[PDB]
Amino acid sequence: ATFEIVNRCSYTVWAAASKGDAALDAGGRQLNSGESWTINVEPGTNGGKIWARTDCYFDDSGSGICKTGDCGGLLRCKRFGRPPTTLAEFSLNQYGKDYIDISNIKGFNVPMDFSPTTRGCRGVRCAADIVGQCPAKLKAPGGGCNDACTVFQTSEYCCTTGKCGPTEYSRFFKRLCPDAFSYVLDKPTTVTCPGSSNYRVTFCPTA
Numbered sequence: 236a237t238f239e240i241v242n243r244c245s246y247t248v249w250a251a252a253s254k255g256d257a258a259l260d261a262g263g264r265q266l267n268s269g270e271s272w273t274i275n276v277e278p279g280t281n282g283g284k285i286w287a288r289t290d291c292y293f294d295d296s297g298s299g300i301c302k303t304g305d306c307g308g309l310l311r312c313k314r315f316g317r318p319p320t321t322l323a324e325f326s327l328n329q330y331g332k333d334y335i336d337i338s339n340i341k342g343f344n345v346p347m348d349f350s351p352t353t354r355g356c357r358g359v360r361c362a363a364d365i366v367g368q369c370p371a372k373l374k375a376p377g378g379g380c381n382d383a384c385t386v387f388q389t390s391e392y393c394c395t396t397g398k399c400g401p402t403e404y405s406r407f408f409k410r411l412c413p414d415a416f417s418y419v420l421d422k423p424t425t426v427t428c429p430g431s432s433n434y435r436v437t438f439c440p441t442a
Contacts, residue, residue, distance in 0.1 A: 236327055237433045239273045239352065240285065242266035244439035248287040248345060251304060251312040252276070259283055262311040265291075266438075278328045278431060285323040286316055287345040287438050289378055302377045303344040318342045319379035321361060321415075323349040323436045333428040337361045338416040339408040343369075344379035348440035356428035361412035362441045370407055382408070382418075394419035 240250045247267050252259040252274055260274035276283060288304035297310035304316035319342025325335045336359060337349050343365040350358025369380035383404035384392040391399050397420075401409070405418035414424050 236276045236278060236280075236333075236431060237273055237352075238276060238285065239271055239433075239435045240266065241271045241435060241437045242268060242287075242439070243437055244268060244287075244345065246289070248289060248438055249291045249293075249301060249304075249310065250285065250436075250438075251288055251306055251316055252283070252285045253306065253312045253315055254280055254283045255315055256313075258311060258313050259285075262313060263288075263306070263309065265310075276325075276327065281326045281329065283325050283327070284315060285325075285349075285436050286320040287347070288316060288320075289344060303375070303379045318385045319344045319375050319381045321345055321347045323347060325349075325434070328430045331430045333430055333432050334425050335359065335428060335434070336416060336423070336425040337412075337414065339365075339412060340382055340384075340416050340419060342373070342375070342380050342382045342385060343408070343412075345438050346440065348435075348437045350435050350437075351428050351432045352435050353429070353432045356426050356432065359414045359424065359426055360440060361415040362439075363411040365408065365411045368407075368411060370404065373404060373407075392418075 288301040290302035293299035306312035409417035
């Protein structure tokens with residue numbers, strides 16, 4: 236499956252793509268404002284994620300640091316990134332279908348649209364200005380908006396026991412971005428696509 240990753244932000248981002256225990260494709264790359272990076276993701280990829288990282292410095296060997304989304308200080312990510320990170324999430328060829336969604340469960344750093352480029356389903360979008368409206372206690376001093384689990388580490392926010400409900404914090408994400416997951420047991424906003432669809436992830440999809 237091809238994913239075209241497009242940076243429409245006015246700032247540089249460093250895209251990242253991982254399934255948690257491995258990179259997808261090169262796993263990471265700098266995208267200046269306007270650039271596009273097409274990756275190939277193996278069919279059957281389960282629990283893949285794509286995200287953006289901001290204000291990064293990498294040296295010549297591709298080690299450094301990112302203010303949001305850092306995945307162990309590597310340009311080429313092999314694991315998931317440090318919150319806050321808006322997440323494009325997908326599982327491909329799962330009993331004949333693809334599954335896609337956007338999640339705010341690990342916070343928000345950059346707006347995003349995640350859409351198929353082939354026929355038979357709709358995309359999802361989380362493009363509101365969540366960083367600017369972020370509640371005080373969720374603001375990440377390093378940039379972005381943390382989820383409440385990251386900030387407070389309680390069973391209710393982390394949904395440790397499997398029984399949580401919506402909270403004042405998760406309702407903030409859901410009000411700004413109704414089509415993204417706002418907490419673990421949120422009513423699914425996952426989109427079912429034909430197996431083997433292709434996709435575009437766009438950072439900052441709107442002016």
